[PDB]
């Protein structure tokens, strides 16, 4: 009773904290709030996954209904057993082939997503969309437009995007000062296919561990 009503306000607790935004309303009933704020707000600690205080047993997810059953890592998919055995609604293969897939072909191979120091998987999360996202931030760059989005845009080949004219009056993108586009800052004769422009960088090892040779263990 008295101890329950003795609690300091969470904002009174914020001042003790160097990173006050992590502390939350429920920290008021922390039996040792001044300590718990220091631990929770300590540098490298990773806050408890928030699926607690929910009674849903951490997975009720509607998204769980729409998750793909599985996908082979493409290196293993090269092994062709996908066609040999149909998992969807004998199969002998070469020892050298399989062994080389894991070792010769797949030594340097690593899953593309993984996760980071403090990455924690909440129920509603799905990594796959973020994998295509990270891969997409990689492939796609300004000045280039795929033929699909080009067809939807109804832009014929050899013709500049509609924002090149408004970009002539307004100016180059503030975010891309080094961006070049045919007809304006960049040679129109170099206009080719899906690329109407490219960023021209103005910036222009061994890491003590350079192996200088790569030799995998041989099965034979």
């Amino acid at each position: 009773k008295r101890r329950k009503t003795e609690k300091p306000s969470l904002s009174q607790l914020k001042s003790q904290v160097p990173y006050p935004q992590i502390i939350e309303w429920y920290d008021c009933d922390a039996r040792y709030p001044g300590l718990l704020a220091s631990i929770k707000c300590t540098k490298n600690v990773i806050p408890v996954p928030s699926h607690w205080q929910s009674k849903k047993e951490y997975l009720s997810g509607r998204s769980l209904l729409g998750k793909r059953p599985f996908e082979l890592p493409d290196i293993i998919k090269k092994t062709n057993i996908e066609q040999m055995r149909s998992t969807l609604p004998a199969l002998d293969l070469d020892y050298k082939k399989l062994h080389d897939v894991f070792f010769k072909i797949g030594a340097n191979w690593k899953p593309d997503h993984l996760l980071c120091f403090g990455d924690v998987y909440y129920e509603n999360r799905n990594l796959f969309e973020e994998t295509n996202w990270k891969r997409m931030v990689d492939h796609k760059r300004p000045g280039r437009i795929s033929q699909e989005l080009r067809a939807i845009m109804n832009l014929p080949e050899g013709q500049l995007p509609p924002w090149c004219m408004k970009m002539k009056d307004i100016g180059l993108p503030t975010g891309y000062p080094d961006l070049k586009i045919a007809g304006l800052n960049w040679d129109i004769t170099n206009l080719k296919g899906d690329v109407y422009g490219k960023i021209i960088p103005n910036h222009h090892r061994n890491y003590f561990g350079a192996l200088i040779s790569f030799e995998t263990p041989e099965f034979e």
């Binding site: 306000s9 969470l10 904002s11 009174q12 914020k14 001042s15 006050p20 935004q21 502390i23 939350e24 309303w25």
Partner: protein, 80 residues
């Protein structure tokens, strides 16, 4: 902080933290927006919280300017 307003649910009040009017009360109050102030209830405490939110030596020629500030010695550049 909001008109001593009444809320019928804790999820809803937890949604009040990101809102137009709630941020208008904060920012117009002088307590700037977003995520540090989320747990606010009363107007008073976040004022001291916002108060919680908000020596170089350029060597003059007499060799006493080792205590002298950068901008001060630049002012003596404009004076010199």
């Amino acid at each position: 902080i909001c008109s001593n307003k009444v809320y019928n649910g804790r999820r809803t009040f937890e949604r009040h933290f990101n809102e137009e009017r709630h941020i208008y009360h904060l920012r117009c109050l002088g307590i700037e927006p977003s995520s540090v102030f989320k747990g606010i209830t009363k107007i008073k405490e976040a004022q001291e919280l916002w108060k919680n939110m908000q020596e170089l030596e350029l060597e003059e020629e007499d060799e006493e300017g080792n205590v002298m500030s950068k901008k001060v010695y630049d002012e003596l550049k404009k004076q010199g």
